[PDB]
Design a protein around this ligand. Structure first.
Ligand SMILES: CC(C)C[C@H](NC(=O)[C@H](CC(C)C)NP(=O)(O)CNC(=O)OCc1ccccc1)C(N)=O
Ligand SMILES: [Ca+2]
Ligand SMILES: [Ca+2]
Ligand SMILES: [Ca+2]
Ligand SMILES: [Ca+2]
Ligand SMILES: [Zn+2]
Length: 316
């Protein structure tokens, strides 16, 4: 909408106060004009029609329980935009400052979030498996990263390419969580998963097997559920990425860690210069090795560590 840029205040899903960029024209809308061609947050009103209505508020204060998922979807989309711009010199998901749209209050009791080809979509959860999913910065960044993937490598959402797609979203979801630097970890979704159980998460990158996901290629799933295991076999790549950053010895193979920033540089370059829609895990290894070679040199520690990490997870 046409209007003037304003600054509202509210509370997110976890009860924390934050400022949000809004637009005033009769109402205050969740429209942040400070980033690219805008970040826009919509109310799906417990239905499944998308996007729903651009979020309108009479007073620019967003402290109601109903407001909290919208506050966080809007704010964390801004953090994710900032990460891609400041860290990777990428302007929005398309590289040309496309408007970023999210809808909250999608459906009833909806235990998921997704990118629908055009926008992000967040359920409220059923209150037991999840609370509203936009409360997780790793979740928001996971979803926006699907848009980045779709505009770049275009990894098909099935089998190995789809597991790479998923891992890219978990990797950058985690790197955005570290960028914001509030309780960062190598777990996925811990802030919104199972409010009655402390210390758990939906997936672990540091130890995928904690939640039954493979941490070695010899343990990959090859059935048909979950699009051929895209959220399962992502554990093999998540583990490799964790090892590249943090190091460790895994199935007897030692990896020298190189840190998160270099992990992000290597995987961003692989995603945007080397991966294709049909890349498999072996092709990802080759893309990561080439990316590290471009950035750091063929004789570098960074190249050696990429090779170590893929060896550790059984990917040649
Ligand atoms: C578990 N969910 C996820 O781990 C994340 C959410 C986590 C980070 C809290 N959602 P996600 O991975 O984004 C969902 N993908 C999806 O709907 O693809 C289909 C689709 C939809 C719409 C268009 C094309 C394809 C799961 N098994 O769905
Ligand atoms: Ca209000
Ligand atoms: Ca965390
Ligand atoms: Ca996390
Ligand atoms: Ca929990
Ligand atoms: Zn995903």
């Amino acid at each position: 909408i046409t209007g003037t840029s304003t600054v509202g205040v509210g509370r997110g899903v976890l009860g924390d106060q934050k400022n949000i960029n809004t637009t005033y024209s009769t109402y205050y809308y969740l429209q942040d004009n400070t980033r690219g061609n805008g970040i826009f947050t919509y109310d799906a009103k417990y239905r499944t029609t998308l996007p729903g209505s651009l979020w309108a508020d009479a007073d620019n204060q967003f402290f109601a329980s109903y407001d909290a998922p919208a506050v966080d979807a809007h704010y964390y989309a801004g953090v994710t935009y900032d990460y891609y711009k400041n860290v990777h010199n990428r302007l929005s998901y398309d590289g040309n400052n496309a408007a970023i749209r999210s809808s909250v209050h999608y459906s009833q009791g909806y235990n998921n979030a997704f990118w629908n080809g055009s926008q992000m979509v967040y359920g409220d959860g059923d209150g037991q498996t999840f609370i509203p999913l936009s409360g997780g910065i790793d979740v928001v960044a996971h979803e926006l990263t699907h848009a980045v993937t779709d505009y770049t490598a275009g990894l098909i959402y099935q089998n190995e390419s789809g597991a790479i797609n998923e891992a890219i979203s978990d990797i950058f979801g985690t790197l955005v969580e570290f960028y914001a630097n509030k309780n960062p970890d190598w777990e996925i979704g811990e802030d919104v998963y199972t409010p009655g159980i402390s210390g758990d998460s939906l997936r672990s990158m540091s130890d995928p097997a904690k939640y039954g996901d493979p941490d070695h290629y010899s343990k990959r799933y090859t059935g048909t559920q979950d699009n051929g295991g895209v959220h399962i076999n992502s554990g093999i790549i998540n583990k490799a990425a964790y090892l590249i950053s943090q190091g460790g010895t895994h199935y007897g193979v030692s990896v020298v860690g190189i840190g998160r920033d270099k992990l992000g540089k290597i995987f961003y370059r692989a995603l945007t210069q080397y991966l294709t829609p049909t890349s498999n895990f072996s092709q990802l290894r080759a893309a990561a090795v080439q990316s590290a070679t471009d950035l750091y040199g063929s004789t570098s520690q960074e190249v050696a560590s990429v090779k170590q990490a893929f060896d550790a997870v059984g990917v040649k």
